[PDB]
Design a protein around this ligand. Structure first.
Ligand SMILES: [Ca+2]
Ligand SMILES: [Ca+2]
Length: 331
């Protein structure tokens, strides 16, 4: 018995439509008053109030933010994510934003591997709005998997989603295209941001970024404008080629290389005028710091589906939030 969704289509003017996979059967509903309500016989699929404002493109640079929490690579593990957030009191008993005016930075990779991808997406979409309502903010950054899915690289999509692509009659990448609520939401997000003296991105920044004289604004804009480009077009343009692949911000794993040095790291820190760089992408056994904590790895292997951790940046300290709800100071 499989339940999945909803997959919401949002036209320019028209009313939105929701597709639900319920017991391997398709259910289609017309959204009224921006309220996405699940049909009868559709298990416990997520229901959410559609928002216009959270699809607005937001700045990629922030100052004077008192508290920030970072985590990454949920990879469809909703239960783990929810447990971690409740244990660390980021959300309340009902699973609603409880971080006040704080900012959350999810450095990408919600998609793939896991079996609760839509659960994670709709939850994050809701948090996005709830955070804004509280005067806080949710920074959902695009990871390499978000780029892969939207672009058509489906090698890591969980097999259970073949049901959806079959019933809704369209490939997985089109289940999150520009005509879908989630797709529109994702296409408004940044890929690299800076909060206070910290830089955040999925993989990491390599020296090539400096060679190309890139800026957060130019990069984030290109990412949004080309996430739907053909692989041919992306690899043809050497700038887009760098941004979207191997040595780029969403794929670079150099910070976890044996040959990478703190000296080289310093040149990168100095280039952005930051003291730390928070990255996901390369899975660790726990949230940890490298090079005297100049780099903080926040991919705590939530993808494994058993546990996860987060990073809390407040009062100039770097704190590790364990799955059991306890904390350990890194710096
Ligand atoms: Ca990942
Ligand atoms: Ca990744």
């Amino acid at each position: 018995t499989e339940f999945d969704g909803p997959y919401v289509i949002t036209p320019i003017s028209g009313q939105s439509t929701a597709y639900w996979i319920c017991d391997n059967r398709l259910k289609t509903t017309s959204i009224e008053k921006l309220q996405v309500n699940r049909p009868e016989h559709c298990g416990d699929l997520p229901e959410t109030k559609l928002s216009s404002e959270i699809k607005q493109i937001m700045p990629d640079t922030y100052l004077g933010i008192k508290k920030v929490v970072a985590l990454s690579d949920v990879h469809g593990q909703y239960d783990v994510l929810l447990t971690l957030l409740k244990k660390q009191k980021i959300i309340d008993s009902d699973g609603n934003w409880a971080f006040g005016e704080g900012h959350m930075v999810m450095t990408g990779d919600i998609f793939d591997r896991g079996h609760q991808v839509n659960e994670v997406l709709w939850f994050m979409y809701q948090l996005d709005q709830q955070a804004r309502d509280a005067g806080g903010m949710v920074h959902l950054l695009m990871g390499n998997h978000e780029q892969m899915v939207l672009g058509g690289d489906l090698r890591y999509v969980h097999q259970r989603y073949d049901i959806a692509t079959t019933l809704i009659n369209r490939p997985y990448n089109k289940l999150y295209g520009a005509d879908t609520e989630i797709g529109q939401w994702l296409r408004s997000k940044n890929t690299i941001i800076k909060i206070n003296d910290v830089l955040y991105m999925h993989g990491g920044i390599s020296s090539e970024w400096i060679s190309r004289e890139l800026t957060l604004d130019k990069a984030n804009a290109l990412y949004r404008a080309n996430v739907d480009a053909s692989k041919k077009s992306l690899k043809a343009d050497d700038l887009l080629n760098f941004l979207f692949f191997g040595n780029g911000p969403t794929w670079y794993r150099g910070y976890f290389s044996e040959t990478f040095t703190e000296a080289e790291l310093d040149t990168i820190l100095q280039h952005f005028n930051v003291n730390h760089i928070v990255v996901g992408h390369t899975s660790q056994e726990r949230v940890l710091g490298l090079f005297h904590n100049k780099v903080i790895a926040v991919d705590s292997s939530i993808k494994v589906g058993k546990s996860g951790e987060l990073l809390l940046l407040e009062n100039n300290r770097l704190i590790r939030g364990l799955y059991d709800g306890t904390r350990e100071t890194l710096q």
